[PDB]
Design a protein around this ligand. Structure first.
Ligand SMILES: Nc1ncnc2c1ncn2[C@@H]1O[C@H](COP(=O)(O)OP(=O)(O)OP(O)(O)=S)[C@@H](O)[C@H]1O
Ligand SMILES: Nc1ncnc2c1ncn2[C@@H]1O[C@H](COP(=O)(O)OP(=O)(O)OP(O)(O)=S)[C@@H](O)[C@H]1O
Ligand SMILES: Nc1ncnc2c1ncn2[C@@H]1O[C@H](COP(=O)(O)OP(=O)(O)OP(O)(O)=S)[C@@H](O)[C@H]1O
Ligand SMILES: Nc1ncnc2c1ncn2[C@@H]1O[C@H](COP(=O)(O)OP(=O)(O)OP(O)(O)=S)[C@@H](O)[C@H]1O
Ligand SMILES: Nc1ncnc2c1ncn2[C@@H]1O[C@H](COP(=O)(O)OP(=O)(O)O)[C@@H](O)[C@H]1O
Ligand SMILES: [Mg+2]
Ligand SMILES: [Mg+2]
Ligand SMILES: [Mg+2]
Ligand SMILES: [Mg+2]
Lengths: 477, 322, 337, 314, 322
């Protein structure tokens, strides 16, 4: 019907110009799917202008709810292909994969044939696009699924598109080089904001831009979560169901609450209940914005800095308590204590007036970035272990400063003829281009490389790519 | 040949000791016939299992082997157990009998949160046709819902009268001679645990049964049980309090090495002795208790034992200077 | 560069003549080779000594090595497929990629490798990241298979090692290289690579700045040789890694400014350092040992800084979120100063 | 015999007391019909399962027996189940009013393994036209990220004291039992937000001692009396506190966990002392609690806790 | 290795433990050899006495047929399919040459070592497997094993050897292997390996086989033994205590940096410092109080797997501030 559908399904994209964010990856996937036929004609050996001609299959990965499935379905439908979809809700064991999909690997569609075959629209209507979605979600009930799908990544005859959430997971190791792996990222705030404004204009109801920015900060970029939360719909809504952590942070940091007249009106039990209001976001919010308030509860002879120091000490104690709690859930009884140490005591110590605005916690984004970079470093070590004899931690600590002087330092001065030397160097360690970018990504400090990598001309980078796509020395087993 | 734990197990209600407060209400429940879901919790070696088995035997007599399901700990603890065995035992009826069936779980506190939720759902489902009686050692490791669904019963440790009556009873049916101080030491060590008493009595029996008539002195009981002697404890405390560092260190090392004692019971006995001293200043007690608790918590994680022993000596000598 | 000139045999080691003598003495009895436990600071050349003892007892074919994958079944339904870098005569296990399956994977892989067939070597890299269950399983395997498995455990500061392990292997320590021997081993490299050294004081300077770290000294020499057109003169601006400079700037900001307005930037710098693959203990150690070298401080401030660092180090080793303890330590430092 | 918790369980959505904005949201949902997939998180015994049950009832009217699939912890929820049965139920044909939908209520969703939760993703995404999932979990952290992204999160706050007091007043009025105000205060103190536990303790008191009075409540709950704990914590001489802990609490066989929890819950309500001293005493009590939970529940730890509390109060 | 060549194979080579062999010789002449529970510190000789008694009472040829040895590997299926089967296998027929020399008892022997960290369900099955059909199980913590097992099994505490009875046997080894040692080396190997004995034998073997490589035939001096076990030598410890006796922060920091860089990388320096500061007779009581307290604090810090450099520097600074 019209009003019975969800907001995520009714407002889902229809073309490729509505998918917000990650335009580069979508364009790369579309170009690869379009030129797949020419690459098949040449036996998958001549990488044409993008190094994406030798890859049989593609792999989509990234955070949850970015548009992976939508983008894949839309780029498959736009070129006139026929979609054969398999997901986690189907038994993708080794025997069942051999039975069902292996037979339909190279065959032609019957629905695609009987659908439209008389008008000269496109010759790829009968061909298959096999979309293996949720490949990371294969449980223990699918034996040999990863290996059989990695084998399917080769010796195939139709565009195979794999979708996962954590590519650098060691379980996904058999997909090392046999598939083109493009990466989806958390879309910029502007695109999500524009999509929200469009949806709100269509639904005929206005919001404050501050509320939109706060929602985008809360959901951490999951567009699906944003739409599903907006569907719940104004001050009462944001103040009681949606943005509750911000209200908790604002109420627990008030100076008038911990005064004697105020404490007798708002006793400790109300503050602990305020913590229990949301026992998953209050400690992080408090740790985020406890040292940005002008106090009014300082003792007669206590400066700001030592009060903040005591608050941080109690914060560390509460973090230890939280680790002890989450180590064993059956210790639920320790939740009240974690209320006082993590949330109530520092706020009490440094309560007062908010200097500026209350910001959402930044620990989640930094933790996700740290996990991603840890997995990237482990993947780099998996390749370079045979020639360094160093630990996965000492590598980043010692080797990479020299690798910068070896890999990119020639490019800034020698120009574009030193490509052979740097390829020779990076081939003594079984290093690839994605590994090169991952290496350059890590350089924090005065040696930041994100500004210089874009400064160099694009012709040099394209020449490097096309020259590297020719020669390869990746075998050591 | 059978262990005294099983041989001297109460077969009826009247053969349990020191639990009158719960026995009267259990008798009221059984003669009224309104037996609800029970939670028997308390320190180990008290009589929970014996009490519930005796109650089941009294209620069902010979058919006890038919309507009583005695389950135990993990035993390949999957959700399949609570989902199939208990569920079919509660849902299916009984043959050639009248009344409600009984399921008794031993040490049901080792269940995870999911298992406890499953069990409380099963209890809520068939609460009209069967009654659950669960045993536990600590009433805090259980979900509050499962605790509320039933009625609790705390089995307080056995006082002197009950354990002495049981010593008399075990002396009736056995040819044994026991010294007046031996029983005093036995009760001081038992802490109110009948199981450990029956464990140590037969061990000392088999130890000194040369003519079947020797007198069980306190030294052999202390050796079989591995508990510190008050004389050695007081001697170590006096040596730490009065003598110098070398002498006190040597005495502590020789006492804890020539007997086979761990620092835990050393600290326990030492603080138990220090509890009743006539201290002048209170900061002494404050520092003593705090530092010895810190030493205990550090010993709990297994450090270098000589360092913690020297720290015990230092704390004792530094707290008793005011 | 650094891997180019690496000794591949006991004769090729130019450091610590005593240890090379002991190793060549051990390599004369292939029939009886006891389990070995090597300990010592990082960047000393103990893995090189392992692969050189292996080269001396076996053929030169030990250095050609390949990575394989083997599968095991855990308690749950998550059958693990783990990688291993092996050789025709030895194999290496680095129990850092997995965290809790240690006591299972170690014992299982060892009992499988013991039964494939004169023995085979298992080098356990980072033998200090093994929980007590892992070490217990390891000593069980050492008791069970003694005729086909010879463990050479590489570790550092072997305090977290259970005593039955220490008893059943020969302990060997590898002291850090003195600046003199570092000077000779750097002169060898600059001679083999025709580097135009102006004086010989730059070698001693690098040795002193490396703090007895051999591989760090070599890496720094190579990194600074690519900046002066392979002509190292007396004006040598010693270059530190890309993270030590940030830590020194943070230390200077802490010393110069003591306020929450600087604590915000300190937390930002800590975020930027942690998100980019740098552990917490390393950051804490570096910040502590850089806060004690400043000349503006007195003895009381340093004696308080070291105590606060010693407490927050345990608090870091006991918690799961590092930024909390790091910010707490920085706040306490600013409170003391 | 019949548990009062089951007999007086709310059946209409308006009878539920406590959270007001979320109950109003659910009322508007049941009045409109367009219900989305929803996770309901919160502390135990606050009305989560009852909420979704009355919601499904008011939504489907005379179709609850045909278009509602409930799976609690006592049922098999593996991979085979979520693949076969849930999918076959989502695809079922059913002629419902233009606003209503089918309902799959999964209780204790945090107990479902990750492998089983992975399979529900496309099942709940593709059939959003005739199937809406409702999860009821205690911890919203054990639910995988995709599920948390799909369905809206609804947190239930812990119950305050006036709401539980009003519910108990309604219960005692409809039950015609004698009571005293201090007995109701003891019930509120012991319940700490658990409405189910409050009703259960009230029924137990009424059935055991007849008159709801603080002494009978503290006798039947089998917990340290808050008055004696307050006297132990607020004593002047440390020797007095140690003697009280020795002869009154430790001798009667109380568990150390119970002693620490009662001390925590009494120090929270000690409105005579200041706020900072209360917070620091709670900090020391929590330190002792964490020490006990690690295997050492020795009397020495409680003695040290009392010593620290006395040193702080002095 | 010497640990297995000179392993005690009969009941009289053992000299350290004496209180445990007399009672077993007393029970020997009766077929009532019961289930038994050995416990104590490692390297005490438990397995030695077990193998000695099995060899004395069963014979050499039957060692592998009816005497079974099981250890702690990874289950319940092992017990329900093999260990119970191993318990119920019809015992092999001892030939006439065995009866000629060895009196055979009418039961089998099954040795389960390391019974400490076993699961309770396996124990509930194992008590049944042993009661319906002997066993000699071993652990080092009697608290972890459940009580139904220890009920029927009689306990034996294998006491840790003292420094007195441990020398002669060691001396015997020095005579049995023609190893040439120094004068004050034996008691050094004893104290460095205090408590356990097999580690002392391995240390002696390693020192002998190392010194023999030099071809000097010289007395094995004590510094070799102190270097093998990883303990810090006395000269470096003297340097440390001299630097910390009177020195500023900078010198202590530089010296501890040099130590952690090139010196002995073990964290056993705190043990040597404790021994030196406690056993000394030059420091007063108020000093030793804080010395012991600081050493205990530093040990508790180091036990948590933290960095040793920072903790050692903090300990040295604190012990210097006094
Ligand atoms: N770029 C986008 N613009 C607008 N809506 C989007 C966008 N990406 C996702 N959505 C919404 O999210 C819904 C489903 O997103 P999907 O792309 O299917 O999620 P996903 O990328 O597959 O991530 P998983 O599979 O759940 S881990 C769509 O129906 C849209 O409503
Ligand atoms: N009250 C009692 N009267 C007489 N014998 C008792 C009593 N309590 C324990 N025993 C003895 O101790 C043995 C063990 O008793 P159980 O009831 O099994 O222990 P429990 O109190 O139920 O707690 P467990 O078994 O340690 S979980 C019994 O077989 C008796 O021999
Ligand atoms: N707000 C409320 N108003 C009235 N009665 C309530 C309320 N909340 C809970 N109850 C009572 O508590 C009983 C149990 O509540 P449930 O919703 O089943 O508990 P729950 O929310 O599912 O939490 P669990 O199942 O323990 S994790 C209900 O049957 C009611 O009698
Ligand atoms: N009293 C003794 N006399 C002579 N040698 C002994 C004595 N006690 C131990 N040993 C030696 O030490 C070795 C240790 O053997 P075990 O009996 O297994 O020691 P242990 O106590 O079992 O150690 P575990 O198995 O780690 S608990 C023996 O093989 C002997 O070589
Ligand atoms: N005798 C030697 N001569 C030259 N270089 C050496 C020698 N010993 C070690 N090295 C250097 O040490 C580096 C290896 O260090 P490594 O053993 O990985 O450190 P760690 O001991 O911390 O694992 C090699 O790059 C090598 O150049
Ligand atoms: Mg998807
Ligand atoms: Mg019992
Ligand atoms: Mg529920
Ligand atoms: Mg042994």
């Amino acid at each position: 019907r019209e009003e019975d559908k969800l907001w995520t399904v009714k407002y889902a994209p229809t073309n490729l110009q509505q998918v917000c964010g990650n335009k580069g990856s979508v364009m790369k996937l579309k170009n690869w799917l379009a030129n797949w036929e020419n690459s098949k004609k040449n036996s998958f050996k001549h990488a044409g202008k993008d190094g994406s001609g030798v890859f049989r299959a593609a792999m989509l990965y990234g955070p949850p709810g970015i548009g992976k499935t939508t983008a894949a379905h839309l780029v498959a439908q736009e070129l006139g292909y026929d979609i054969l979809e398999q997901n986690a809700s189907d038994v993708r064991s080794k025997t069942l994969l051999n039975a069902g999909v292996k037979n339909a690997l190279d065959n032609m569609s019957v629905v695609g044939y009987f659908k439209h075959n008389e008008e000269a629209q496109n010759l790829n209507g009968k061909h298959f696009v096999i979309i293996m979605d949720e490949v990371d979600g294969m449980s223990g009930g699918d034996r040999g699924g990863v290996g059989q799908l990695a084998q399917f990544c080769r010796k195939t005859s139709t565009p195979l598109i794999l979708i996962c959430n954590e590519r650098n997971l060691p379980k996904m190791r058999p997909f090392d080089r046999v598939c083109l792996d493009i990466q989806f990222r958390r879309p910029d705030a502007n695109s999500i904001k524009s999509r929200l404004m469009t949806i709100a204009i269509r639904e005929k109801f206005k919001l404050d831009p501050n509320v939109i920015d706060r929602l985008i900060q809360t959901t951490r970029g999951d567009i699906r979560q944003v739409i599903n939360l907006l569907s719940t719909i104004s001050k009462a809504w944001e103040k009681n169901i949606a943005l509750k952590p911000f209200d908790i942070a604002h109420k627990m940091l008030d100076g008038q609450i911990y005064s004697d007249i105020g404490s007798r009106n708002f006793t400790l039990n109300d503050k602990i209940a305020l913590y229990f209001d949301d026992f998953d976001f209050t400690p992080l919010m408090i740790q985020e914005n406890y040292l940005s308030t002008r106090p009014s509860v300082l003792k007669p002879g206590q400066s700001h800095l030592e009060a903040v120091a005591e608050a941080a000490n109690c914060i560390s104690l509460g973090d230890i308590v939280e680790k002890k709690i989450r180590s064993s859930e059956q210790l639920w009884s320790l939740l009240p204590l974690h209320a006082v140490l993590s949330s109530v005591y520092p706020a009490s110590k440094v309560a007062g007036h908010m200097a500026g605005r209350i910001n959402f916690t930044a620990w989640l984004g930094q933790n996700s970035k740290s996990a991603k970079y840890y997995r990237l470093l482990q993947e780099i070590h998996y390749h370079t272990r045979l020639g360094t004899s160093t630990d996965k931690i000492g590598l980043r600590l010692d080797y990479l400063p020299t690798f910068r002087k070896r890999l990119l330092d020639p490019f800034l001065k020698q120009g574009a003829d030193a490509i052979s030397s740097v390829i020779e160097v990076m081939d003594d360690y079984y290093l690839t281009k994605e590994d090169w970018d991952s290496i350059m990504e890590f350089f924090v400090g005065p040696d930041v490389t994100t500004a210089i990598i874009k400064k160099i001309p694009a012709t040099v980078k394209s020449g490097f790519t096309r020259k590297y796509n020719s020669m390869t020395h990746p075998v050591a087993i | 040949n059978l262990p005294w734990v099983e041989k001297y197990r109460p077969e009826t209600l009247d053969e349990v000791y020191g639990q009158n407060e719960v026995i009267t209400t259990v008798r009221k429940f059984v003669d009224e016939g309104k037996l609800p879901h029970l939670l028997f919790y308390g320190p180990p070696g008290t009589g929970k299992t014996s009490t519930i088995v005796a109650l089941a035997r009294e209620i069902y007599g010979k058919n006890y082997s038919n309507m009583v399901l005695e389950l135990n700990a993990s035993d390949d603890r999957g959700i399949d157990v609570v989902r199939n065995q208990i569920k079919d035992f509660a849902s299916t009826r009984q043959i050639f009998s009248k009344g409600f069936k009984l399921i008794i779980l031993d040490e049901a506190d080792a269940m995870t949160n999911a298992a406890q939720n499953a069990l409380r759902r099963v209890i809520e489902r068939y609460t009209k046709n069967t009654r659950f009686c669960v045993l536990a050692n600590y009433a805090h490791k259980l979900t509050p819902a499962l605790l509320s669904r039933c009625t609790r019963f705390r089995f307080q440790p056995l006082p002197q009268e009950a354990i002495e009556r049981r010593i008399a009873n075990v002396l009736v049916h056995e040819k044994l001679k026991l010294s007046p101080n031996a029983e005093k030491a036995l009760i001081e060590l038992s802490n109110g645990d009948m199981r450990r008493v029956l464990n140590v009595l037969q061990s000392c029996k088999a130890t000194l049964d040369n003519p079947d008539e020797d007198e069980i002195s306190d030294d052999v009981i202390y050796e079989c049980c591995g508990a510190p002697r008050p004389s050695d404890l007081k001697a170590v405390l006096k040596s730490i309090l009065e003598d110098d560092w070398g002498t006190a260190h040597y005495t502590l090392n020789k006492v804890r090495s020539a007997k086979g004692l761990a620092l835990i019971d050393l600290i326990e006995g030492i603080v138990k002795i220090l509890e009743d001293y006539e201290l002048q200043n209170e900061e002494t007690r404050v520092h003593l208790l705090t530092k010895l608790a810190d030493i205990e918590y550090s010993i709990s994680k297994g450090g270098n034992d000589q360092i913690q022993g020297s720290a015990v000596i230092g704390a004792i000598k530094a707290s008793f200077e005011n | 560069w650094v891997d180019k000139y690496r000794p591949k045999s006991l004769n090729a080691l130019s450091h610590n003549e005593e240890l090379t003598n002991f190793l060549k003495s051990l390599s004369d009895q292939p029939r009886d080779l006891p389990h070995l436990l090597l300990y010592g600071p990082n960047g000393t050349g103990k893995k090189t000594r392992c692969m050189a003892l292996l080269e001396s007892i076996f053929g030169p074919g030990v250095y050609r090595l390949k990575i394989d994958v083997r599968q095991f079944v855990t308690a749950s339904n998550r059958k693990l497929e783990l990688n291993v870098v092996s050789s025709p005569y030895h194999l290496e296990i680095t129990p850092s990629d997995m965290g809790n399956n240690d006591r299972i994977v170690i014992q299982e892989l060892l009992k499988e490798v013991a039964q494939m067939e004169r023995y085979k070597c298992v080098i356990i890299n980072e033998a200090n990241s093994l929980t007590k269950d892992a070490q217990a399983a390891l000593r069980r395997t050492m008791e069970k298979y003694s005729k086909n498995i010879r463990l050479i455990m590489v570790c550092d500061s072997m305090s977290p090692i259970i005593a039955p392990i220490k008893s059943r292997c020969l302990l060997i320590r590898c002291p850090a290289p003195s600046d003199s021997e570092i000077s000779t081993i750097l002169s060898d490299v600059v001679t083999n690579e025709r580097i135009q050294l102006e004086t010989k004081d730059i070698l001693k300077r690098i040795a002193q700045a490396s703090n007895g770290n051999l591989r760090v000294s070599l890496l720094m020499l190579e990194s600074m040789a690519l900046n002066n057109e392979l002509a190292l003169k007396s004006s040598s601006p010693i270059i530190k890694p890309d993270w030590i400079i940030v830590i020194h700037k943070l230390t200077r900001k802490i010393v110069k400014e003591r306020s929450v307005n600087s604590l915000i930037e300190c937390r930002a710098v800590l975020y930027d350092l942690l998100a980019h693959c740098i552990p917490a203990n390393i950051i804490l150690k570096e910040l502590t040992f850089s806060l004690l070298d400043v000349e503006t401080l007195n003895t009381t401030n340093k004696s308080s800084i070291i105590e606060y660092s010693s407490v927050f180090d345990e608090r870091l080793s006991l918690g799961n979120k590092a930024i909390f303890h790091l910010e707490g330590f920085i706040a306490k430092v600013m409170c003391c100063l | 015999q019949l548990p009062w918790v089951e007999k007086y369980r709310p059946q209409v959505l308006s009878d539920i007391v406590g959270n007001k904005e979320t109950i109003d949201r659910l009322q508007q949902i049941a009045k409109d019909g367009n219900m989305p997939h929803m996770i309901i998180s919160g502390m135990p015994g606050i009305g989560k399962t009852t909420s979704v049950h009355c919601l499904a009832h008011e939504l489907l009217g005379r179709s609850y027996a045909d278009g509602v699939l409930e799976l609690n912890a006592s049922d098999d929820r593996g991979i085979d189940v979520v693949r076969n049965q849930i999918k076959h139920f989502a695809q079922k044909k059913l002629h419902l009013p233009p606003g209503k939908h089918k309902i799959v209520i999964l209780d204790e969703a945090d107990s479902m393994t990750a492998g089983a939760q992975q399979a529900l993703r496309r099942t709940m995404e593709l059939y959003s036209n005739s199937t809406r999932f409702a999860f009821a979990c205690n911890q919203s952290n054990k639910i995988i990220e995709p599920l948390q992204s799909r369905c809206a999160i609804l947190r239930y706050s812990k119950l305050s004291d006036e709401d539980v007091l009003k519910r108990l007043l309604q219960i005692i009025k409809l039950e015609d039992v004698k009571y005293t105000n201090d007995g109701l205060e003891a019930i509120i103190f012991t319940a700490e937000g658990d409405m189910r536990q409050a009703i259960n303790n009230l029924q137990s008191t009424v059935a055991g001692h007849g008159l709801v009075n603080a002494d009978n409540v503290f006798k039947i709950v089998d917990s340290p009396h808050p008055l004696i704990v307050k006297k132990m914590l607020l004593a002047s001489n440390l020797e007095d506190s140690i003697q009280i802990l020795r002869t009154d609490l430790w001798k009667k066989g109380y568990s150390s966990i119970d002693i620490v929890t009662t001390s925590f819950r009494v120090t929270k309500n000690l409105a005579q002392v200041k706020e900072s001293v209360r917070l620091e005493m709670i900090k020391e009590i929590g330190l002792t609690h964490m020490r006990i939970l690690e295997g050492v529940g020795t009397y020495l730890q409680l003695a040290s806790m009392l010593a620290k509390i006395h040193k702080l109060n002095n | 290795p010497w640990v297995e060549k000179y392993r005690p194979k009969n009941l009289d080579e053992v000299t350290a433990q004496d209180h445990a062999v007399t009672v077993l010789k007393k029970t020997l002449k009766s077929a009532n050899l019961p289930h038994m529970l050995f416990y104590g510190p490692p390297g005490t000789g438990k397995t030695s006495t077990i193998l000695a008694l099995t060899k004395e009472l069963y014979g050499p040829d039957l060692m592998k047929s009816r005497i079974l040895e099981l250890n702690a590997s990874d289950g319940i299926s092992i017990v329900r399919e093999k260990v119970k089967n191993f318990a119920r296998l019809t015992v092999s027929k001892p030939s006439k040459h065995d009866l000629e020399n060895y009196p055979c008892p009418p039961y089998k022997i099954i040795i389960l070592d390391e019974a400490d960290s076993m699961t309770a369900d396996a124990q509930s099955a194992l008590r049944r497997t042993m009661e319906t059909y002997r066993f000699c199980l071993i652990c080092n913590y009697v608290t972890r094993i459940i009580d139904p097992l220890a009920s029927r099994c009689s306990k034996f505490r294998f006491k840790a050897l003292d420094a007195s009875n441990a020398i002669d046997r060691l001396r015997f080894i020095s005579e049995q292997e023609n190893v040439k040692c120094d004068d004050g080396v034996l008691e050094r190997i004893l104290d460095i390996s205090a408590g356990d004995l097999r580690r002392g034998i391995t240390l002696l073997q390693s020192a002998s086989k190392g010194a023999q490589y030099l071809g000097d035939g010289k007395n094995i001096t004590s510094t070799q033994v102190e270097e093998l076990a990883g303990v810090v030598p006395h000269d470096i410890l003297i340097e440390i205590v001299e630097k910390v006796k009177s020195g500023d922060f900078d010198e202590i920091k530089k010296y501890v940096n040099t130590f952690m860089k090139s010196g002995w990388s073990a964290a056993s320096v705190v043990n040597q410092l404790h021994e030196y500061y406690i056993t000394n007779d030059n420091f007063d009581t108020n000093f030793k109080n804080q010395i012991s307290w600081l050493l205990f604090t530093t040990d508790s810090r180091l036990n948590n797997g933290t960095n040793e450099h920072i903790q050692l520097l903090n300990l040295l600074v604190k012990i210097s501030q006094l």
